[PDB]
A = this chain, B = another copy of it.
């Protein structure tokens, strides 16, 4: 009769019958691979109802493959693997470094689909690029807690008596073709105490324009006046603010 019966049973595949058990001549039935199965590229996935109520032949066209290789931050799959989804056991794909990573020549940038349907063990075939030597801050310091490779953070400080002007930290971030420091080296600026206080009936010996950390100012009483107190005071520096060590002496008469 001008109709075929049920199409052939294909291992690991299911046909789309659309609710019927009888099919007219020239009917084309397509099979879909079952769960955990991927169709083999370049193979038929359908049958056709021919004359004599006979279906055309069809061979197993499904496998048995690894999942799409897991997403790496250091490397991306090369072409053509990057567009593929069929990875039977034994399949080896190749990677290439992303930015800002570079190849570790001693290591293979390849992964193999194993018998258990899993990709081989991942090694660091693509490593983190390094940022330039951070250098130095005059009268300050640079803290490098964990190297200077891509993704690293460094911090800046100014020594006692100096004030930081600029950025307090920097990060090694990807910059176009390479990796560079997010921020430039800041500046450590000398902290000045307020102008030293004058005293009644006394003077400052050779008063300077500016007083920095630990610098001192010496007092002297005018003729006929007696000194009572510290002959000199010095500049203390805390939390980036200058402040004299204590009050200036007194010059009492007479």
Contacts and interface: CB of A to CB of B under 8 A. Distances in A.
Interface of A: 133-134, 136, 139, 141-148, 159-160, 205-206, 214-216, 218, 220-221, 223, 226-234, 245, 249
22 contacts: A133-B220, A136-B218, A136-B232, A139-B214, A141-B218, A141-B234, A142-B232, A143-B218, A143-B220, A143-B229, A143-B231, A144-B228, A144-B229, A144-B231, A145-B220, A145-B221, A145-B228, A146-B221, A146-B223, A147-B223, A148-B227, A159-B245
Given A160-B214, A160-B215, A214-B159, A141 B221 contact: no
A232 B141 CA distance: 6
Contacts of A234: 141, 159
Contacts of A221: 145-146
Contacts of A205: 141-144
Contacts of A230: 141-144
A6 to B, nearest CB: 61
Contacts of A146: 220-221, 223, 226, 228
A72 to B, nearest CB: 20
How many copies of this chain does one complex carry?
2
Given A159-B245, A226-B147, A142 B214 contact: no
Given A143-B205, A144-B230, A145-B221, 19 more contacts: A136-B218, A141-B206, A141-B216, A141-B230, A141-B231, A141-B232, A141-B234, A142-B231, A143-B220, A144-B227, A144-B228, A144-B229, A145-B227, A145-B228, A145-B231, A146-B220, A146-B221, A159-B215, A159-B245
A128 to B, nearest CB: 11
A199 to B, nearest CB: 13
B159 A232 contact: no
